[PDB]
Design an enzyme around this catalytic site. Structure first.
Site, PDB file in Angstrom:
ATOM      1  N   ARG A 255      -0.079   9.235   0.774  1.00 10.12           N
ATOM      2  CA  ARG A 255      -0.770   9.319   2.050  1.00 10.12           C
ATOM      3  C   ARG A 255      -0.097   8.470   3.131  1.00 10.12           C
ATOM      4  O   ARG A 255      -0.297   8.725   4.312  1.00 10.12           O
ATOM      5  CB  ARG A 255      -2.245   8.955   1.889  1.00 10.12           C
ATOM      6  CG  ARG A 255      -2.504   7.472   1.857  1.00 10.12           C
ATOM      7  CD  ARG A 255      -3.920   7.214   1.530  1.00 10.12           C
ATOM      8  NE  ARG A 255      -3.939   6.763   0.148  1.00 10.12           N
ATOM      9  CZ  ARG A 255      -3.869   5.489  -0.193  1.00 10.12           C
ATOM     10  NH1 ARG A 255      -3.836   4.581   0.765  1.00 10.12           N
ATOM     11  NH2 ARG A 255      -3.860   5.146  -1.473  1.00 10.12           N
ATOM     12  N   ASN A 256       0.738   7.502   2.731  1.00 11.45           N
ATOM     13  CA  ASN A 256       1.330   6.520   3.656  1.00 11.45           C
ATOM     14  C   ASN A 256       2.810   6.751   3.919  1.00 11.45           C
ATOM     15  O   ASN A 256       3.515   5.863   4.415  1.00 11.45           O
ATOM     16  CB  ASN A 256       1.093   5.090   3.177  1.00 11.45           C
ATOM     17  CG  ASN A 256      -0.305   4.629   3.440  1.00 11.45           C
ATOM     18  OD1 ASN A 256      -0.920   5.046   4.416  1.00 11.45           O
ATOM     19  ND2 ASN A 256      -0.836   3.803   2.552  1.00 11.45           N
TER      20      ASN A 256
ATOM     21  N   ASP B  95       2.804   3.265   7.312  1.00 10.25           N
ATOM     22  CA  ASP B  95       1.669   2.326   7.228  1.00 10.25           C
ATOM     23  C   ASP B  95       2.005   0.878   6.879  1.00 10.25           C
ATOM     24  O   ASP B  95       1.472   0.305   5.917  1.00 10.25           O
ATOM     25  CB  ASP B  95       0.530   2.849   6.366  1.00 10.25           C
ATOM     26  CG  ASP B  95      -0.788   2.109   6.650  1.00 10.25           C
ATOM     27  OD1 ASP B  95      -1.414   2.378   7.717  1.00 10.25           O
ATOM     28  OD2 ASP B  95      -1.166   1.226   5.829  1.00 10.25           O
TER      29      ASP B  95
ATOM     30  N   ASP C 252       0.817  -1.202   0.000  1.00  6.74           N
ATOM     31  CA  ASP C 252       0.000   0.000   0.000  1.00  6.74           C
ATOM     32  C   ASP C 252       0.851   1.252   0.000  1.00  6.74           C
ATOM     33  O   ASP C 252       0.603   2.173   0.796  1.00  6.74           O
ATOM     34  CB  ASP C 252      -0.920  -0.014   1.230  1.00  6.74           C
ATOM     35  CG  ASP C 252      -2.088   0.941   1.114  1.00  6.74           C
ATOM     36  OD1 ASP C 252      -2.809   0.967   2.139  1.00  6.74           O
ATOM     37  OD2 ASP C 252      -2.305   1.641   0.075  1.00  6.74           O
TER      38      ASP C 252
HETATM   39  O1  LIG Z   1       0.055  14.489  12.380  1.00  5.65           O
HETATM   40  C1  LIG Z   1       1.246  14.720  12.493  1.00  5.65           C
HETATM   41  N1  LIG Z   1       1.788  15.942  12.293  1.00  5.65           N
HETATM   42  C2  LIG Z   1       0.923  17.076  12.176  1.00  5.65           C
HETATM   43  C3  LIG Z   1       1.112  17.631  10.792  1.00  5.65           C
HETATM   44  N2  LIG Z   1       0.234  18.808  10.666  1.00  5.65           N
HETATM   45  C4  LIG Z   1      -0.687  18.666   9.508  1.00  5.65           C
HETATM   46  C5  LIG Z   1      -1.700  19.779   9.636  1.00  5.65           C
HETATM   47  O2  LIG Z   1      -0.949  20.978   9.540  1.00  5.65           O
HETATM   48  C6  LIG Z   1      -0.190  21.158  10.742  1.00  5.65           C
HETATM   49  C7  LIG Z   1       0.934  20.132  10.758  1.00  5.65           C
HETATM   50  N3  LIG Z   1       2.235  13.853  12.863  1.00  5.65           N
HETATM   51  C8  LIG Z   1       2.033  12.503  13.013  1.00  5.65           C
HETATM   52  N4  LIG Z   1       2.959  11.601  13.218  1.00  5.65           N
HETATM   53  C9  LIG Z   1       2.401  10.351  13.314  1.00  5.65           C
HETATM   54  C10 LIG Z   1       3.119   9.184  13.512  1.00  5.65           C
HETATM   55  C11 LIG Z   1       2.421   8.004  13.577  1.00  5.65           C
HETATM   56  C12 LIG Z   1       1.049   7.964  13.450  1.00  5.65           C
HETATM   57  S1  LIG Z   1       0.244   6.379  13.519  1.00  5.65           S
HETATM   58  C13 LIG Z   1       0.732   5.883  11.863  1.00  5.65           C
HETATM   59  N5  LIG Z   1       1.534   4.875  11.577  1.00  5.65           N
HETATM   60  N6  LIG Z   1       1.718   4.764  10.217  1.00  5.65           N
HETATM   61  C14 LIG Z   1       1.025   5.719   9.653  1.00  5.65           C
HETATM   62  C15 LIG Z   1       0.853   6.075   8.298  1.00  5.65           C
HETATM   63  C16 LIG Z   1       0.093   7.116   7.946  1.00  5.65           C
HETATM   64  C17 LIG Z   1      -0.508   7.811   9.109  1.00  5.65           C
HETATM   65  C18 LIG Z   1      -1.276   9.011   8.775  1.00  5.65           C
HETATM   66  C19 LIG Z   1      -1.931   9.153   7.566  1.00  5.65           C
HETATM   67  C20 LIG Z   1      -2.597  10.338   7.334  1.00  5.65           C
HETATM   68  C21 LIG Z   1      -2.584  11.344   8.288  1.00  5.65           C
HETATM   69  F1  LIG Z   1      -3.228  12.516   8.062  1.00  5.65           F
HETATM   70  C22 LIG Z   1      -1.922  11.188   9.490  1.00  5.65           C
HETATM   71  C23 LIG Z   1      -1.265  10.005   9.731  1.00  5.65           C
HETATM   72  N7  LIG Z   1      -0.380   7.516  10.371  1.00  5.65           N
HETATM   73  N8  LIG Z   1       0.388   6.438  10.636  1.00  5.65           N
HETATM   74  C24 LIG Z   1       0.316   9.124  13.251  1.00  5.65           C
HETATM   75  C25 LIG Z   1       1.021  10.308  13.184  1.00  5.65           C
HETATM   76  S2  LIG Z   1       0.434  11.914  12.930  1.00  5.65           S
END
Ligand SMILES: O=C(NCCN1CCOCC1)Nc1nc2ccc(Sc3nnc4ccc(-c5ccc(F)cc5)nn34)cc2s1
Length: 240
Positions: A109-110, A123, A105
């Site tokens: 987005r991942n 992911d 996948d």
């Molecule tokens: O969210 C932020 N940063 C904020 C960024 N913002 C955006 C808005 O503007 C202000 C700045 N950091 C993060 N780090 C992590 C670290 C681990 C995890 S679990 C995990 N394990 N594999 C995956 C693979 C993909 C996704 C995922 C997909 C789409 C999304 F949308 C968010 C997360 N999650 N995931 C979640 C987060 S979320």
């Protein structure tokens, strides 16, 4: 029994400390963590440790997912930047491929972006049909390979060069296979260098054994990347 100890840590996803963290909500779980933990690469998302709730703790990625980063209108990527993200992904996938790991996948987005703007392929593992990213043979067998990860990768570069446009917006997911088999690929993004589109088409080779390896992709994209100086700003299509 004691084989999971290096993975274990004591004092839906949540914020955390110990490093800023994402902290997500029995024998399988212990074993998977040990497999996942032994992956280590600057372009692959780390498992930090596991906890009992149970908890999966991953590094917090400052800039979130790569498709949202590039879509954000208040960000001004250059062609160089975007090929640079693609080069990073390719390096992460090279590592995963060397570990005989089939992602299945791969998509913008991942992939995630930390505070140094390092892209981490994510992911997968405990941190885990995307038809528009799938190889023709995988759309036919529901079987995935590293060479079918290569296809997805070529879609991911497409996403890169369009700043997060959805692939084949006019094709409904139920229809992609018929559409492709008429003799079609994704079209060349306005800001996609000819040499990078040639790579995209290689990654979409009709014969899977004919697609380049991720090692080949790293080498090739590293060359094209070095030709740019970050003078060309990538704008967004009006049709996507
Ligand atoms: O969210 C932020 N940063 C904020 C960024 N913002 C955006 C808005 O503007 C202000 C700045 N950091 C993060 N780090 C992590 C670290 C681990 C995890 S679990 C995990 N394990 N594999 C995956 C693979 C993909 C996704 C995922 C997909 C789409 C999304 F949308 C968010 C997360 N999650 N995931 C979640 C987060 S979320």
């Amino acid at each position: 029994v004691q084989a999971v100890q290096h993975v274990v840590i004591g004092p839906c996803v949540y914020h955390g400390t110990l490093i800023h963290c994402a902290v997500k909500s029995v024998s399988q779980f212990l074993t998977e963590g040990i497999i996942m933990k032994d992956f280590s690469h600057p372009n692959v998302l780390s498992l930090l440790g596991i906890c009992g709730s149970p908890l999966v703790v991953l590094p917090y990625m400052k800039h979130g997912d790569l498709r949202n980063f590039i879509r954000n209108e208040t960000h001004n990527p250059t062609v160089k930047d975007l090929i640079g993200f693609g080069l990073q992904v390719a390096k992460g996938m090279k590592f995963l491929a060397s570990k005989k790991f089939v992602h299945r996948d791969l998509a913008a987005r991942n992939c995630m972006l930390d505070e140094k703007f390092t892209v981490k392929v994510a992911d997968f593992g405990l941190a885990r049909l995307p038809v528009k990213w799938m190889a023709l043979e995988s759309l036919q067998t529901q079987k995935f390979t590293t060479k079918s990860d290569v296809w997805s990768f070529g879609v991911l570069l497409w996403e890169l060069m369009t700043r997060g446009a959805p692939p084949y917006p006019d094709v409904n997911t139920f229809d992609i296979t018929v559409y492709l088999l008429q003799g079609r690929r994704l079209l060349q993004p306005e800001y996609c260098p000819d040499p990078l589109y040639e790579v995209m088409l290689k990654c979409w080779h009709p014969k899977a054994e004919m697609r380049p390896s991720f090692s080949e992709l790293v080498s090739r994209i590293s060359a094209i990347f070095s030709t740019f100086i970050g003078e060309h700003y990538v704008h967004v299509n009006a049709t996507y």
